[PDB]
Write a protein that binds this DNA or RNA. Sequence first.
DNA 1: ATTATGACGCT
DNA 2: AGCGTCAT
Length: 430
Amino acid sequence: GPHMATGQDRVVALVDMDCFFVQVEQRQNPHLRNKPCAVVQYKSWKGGGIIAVSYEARAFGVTRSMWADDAKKLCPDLLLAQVRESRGKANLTKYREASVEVMEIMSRFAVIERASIDEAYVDLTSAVQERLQKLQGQPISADLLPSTYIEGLPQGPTVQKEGMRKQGLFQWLDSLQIDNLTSPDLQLTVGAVIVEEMRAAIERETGFQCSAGISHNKVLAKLACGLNKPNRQTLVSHGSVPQLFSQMPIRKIRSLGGKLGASVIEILGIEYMGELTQFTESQLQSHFGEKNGSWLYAMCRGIEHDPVKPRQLPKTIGCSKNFPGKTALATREQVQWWLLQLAQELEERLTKDRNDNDRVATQLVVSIRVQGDKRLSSLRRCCALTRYDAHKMSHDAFTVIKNCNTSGIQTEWSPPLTMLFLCATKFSAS
DNA sequence: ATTATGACGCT
DNA sequence: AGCGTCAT
Ligand SMILES: Nc1nc2c(ncn2[C@H]2C[C@H](O)[C@@H](COP(=O)(O)NP(=O)(O)OP(=O)(O)O)O2)c(=O)[nH]1
Ligand SMILES: [Mg+2]
Ligand SMILES: [Mg+2]
């Protein structure tokens, strides 16, 4: 009771751009604004593969990983934008630049952990404390939280969504104002005020809309963020966790969407995150290992300690291309030519990186997939990255993998390669 | 023919 | 160092 930690020590937010690549294309081409739209890679095969979908298009059932030709059957008026293609591969530069715009703004408010091209975690604990002092005990107005949902509210004794949002917010604030709500709850509330400000700054300065989650840890903040997309933010308090998790499928939680999550469900015979609470830590550790067990025991109670790492830049810089089915690379000249295309793009990105961020990568990782192999990578080899030189990088990459070629003939390559992937890693100060 | 390419744990 | 998981 007295001595039990409740995991309410921090205020953490997760900010994620709405249909990010689509908004980047919509900003540049106003014709696409406010319309069912998607972003695809390539064009020849089935119209290209969709990787981003505007909310207008999602209403027709359009989804990521759908072929554009197929999406067009669901949504005849779907507008498409295709990622830039350079050297015969996808070139995501425009979205990486857009990403920097957003990350730079977020970094003004607080320490952030870049989690993906379109999202960052924010540790707002200190910022909250500072605002609480400036506030001097002033009541927090609903006006300061124009886009915030309080998960779990309203409750008790609204037909329209904005009506529900407001009633929930009023219930929440009226309880904070009375003083019934905990200090952790006040802290989350101030975090939400700051996040409103962060999101307003992002929209004003970039034109991009986003959603956000505010809670006491990264897992809950990420979960919260997705609850009310698009263009809204959600506050998930410690107290909201029991009801929220009671019907929350285990696969919903970050890190549990794959094999581990499936084994939890299968071994324990449960469906929802809340059901995890009936097991002892030791039980969970025995089934899922010491680290995962401990993590699950705390998580199902809404507690997680993974820190927001101070990292605004990616740890690696890489590029890859698949060669599916019949296009699989089958000659030595072919492998080398594509290795050079990958290396050239990478050299460009690495040079820019060195200039902007005062660092140099020192290791080059080469990954390939062989035909018939389900795995992401069939083989990984590394060499020293001593020069930002595409010819040298591609030549070195070839040197470390050329062994894989079973065929006696130099010209032929077997087994055929279904992916090439060059990753620059092990950065150091420059 | 689910592509491009990230972080990160285990050994 | 080299492979497996989770992600979208
Ligand atoms: N190349 C590539 N890019 C991808 C892929 N999947 C996603 N992206 C790119 C395109 C995405 O726009 C972007 C951000 O990823 P999300 O935040 O997961 N989805 P979004 O922001 O689109 O919508 P919302 O958050 O409102 O649901 O990453 C992929 O499989 N391949
Ligand atoms: Mg997003
Ligand atoms: Mg995202």
